[PDB]
């Protein structure tokens, strides 16, 4: 079944750091970064070759207008929220995450959520056409937004506009989004303090989902096995590592198995001398 996702996130910060923009705003198709806006540049730029190639100047100017609009409102929001929480100065952030998921071309999810200082604040419940207040300070936002009848317009964006654009983007980037890149895998070992730690590292795979397991006696061994999760490379590919602790002299009893969409059968790898 063909699943696709469009997600926009944005952050407004009181303390981004020296030289850095206080407002950053990015979009993702199927988890791949494709657009970026910030408060210094004051425009959206492409982050994939397919959007650069297929979008025209009207698209960029139109998105830039939205970015500038959102920058302005989130600047206001930071001030509003600091006052609501009775806070002056210090480090504070407003974050938003929203978008849509489609399955065989049809919408299966639409969401619109905010966090303040890293904790859930409000979310749209599209099913009841209300806004949730995760914390007491969000009750005035719920009230304001429900009284203003914004739910209709937000539902239309999430079920129509978002979906239409996601369908277009998936067409623009079909070959790139559907590609497979095989991991290059290395097993490495280090002994210390009477423990042989074996590492299985998979470099450069796409898409992101992978399973990397340590086997002993034919069986997956999660005991003393630790995964670093899936982390990004610079280039649209991913990395993962998994370790297991073994007894010195037991190295040849272990085998790493890698399951990934690029590999018709799982890869199997052992520790070389």
């Amino acid at each position: 079944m063909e699943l696709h996702t469009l997600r926009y996130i944005r952050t407004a910060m009181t303390d981004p750091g020296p030289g850095l923009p206080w407002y950053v705003d990015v979009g993702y198709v199927d988890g791949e970064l494709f657009v970026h806006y910030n408060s210094t540049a004051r425009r959206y730029v492409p982050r994939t070759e397919w959007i650069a190639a297929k979008a025209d100047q009207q698209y960029w100017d139109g998105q830039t207008q939205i970015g500038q609009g959102n920058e302005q409102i989130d600047r206001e929001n930071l001030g509003i929220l600091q006052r609501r929480y009775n806070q002056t100065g210090g480090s504070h952030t407003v974050q938003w995450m929203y978008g849509c998921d489609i399955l065989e071309g049809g919408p299966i999810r639409g969401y619109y959520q905010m966090a303040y200082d890293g904790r859930d604040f409000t979310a749209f419940d599209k099913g009841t056409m209300t806004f949730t207040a995760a914390v007491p300070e969000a009750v005035p936002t719920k009230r304001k937004w429900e009284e203003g009848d914004y739910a209709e317009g937000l539902k239309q964006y999430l079920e129509e506009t978002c979906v239409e654009w996601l369908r277009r983007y998936v067409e623009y980037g079909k070959a790139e989004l559907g590609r497979r890149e095989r991991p290059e895998v290395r097993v490495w070992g280090k002994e210390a303090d009477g423990i042989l730690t074996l590492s299985c590292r998979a470099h450069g795979f796409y898409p992101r989902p992978i399973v990397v397991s340590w086997l002993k006696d034919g069986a997956v061994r999660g005991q003393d096995a630790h995964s670093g999760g899936i982390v990004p490379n610079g280039d649209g590919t991913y990395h993962t590592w998994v370790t297991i602790d073994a007894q010195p002299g037991d190295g040849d009893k272990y085998q790493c198995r890698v399951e990934h969409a690029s590999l018709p059968q799982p890869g199997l790898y052992s520790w070389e001398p």
Binding site: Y8, D25, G27, V35, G62, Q63, Q65, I66, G67, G69, N70, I73, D74, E76, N77, I80, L81, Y98, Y112, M114, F121, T122, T141, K144, W145, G148, Y150, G153, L154, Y157, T161, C162, W165
Partner: peptide, 9 residues
């Protein structure tokens, strides 16, 4: 496309 926020909090 992104969405322009409809109202401040």
């Amino acid at each position: 496309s992104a969405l322009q926020a409809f109202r401040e909090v």
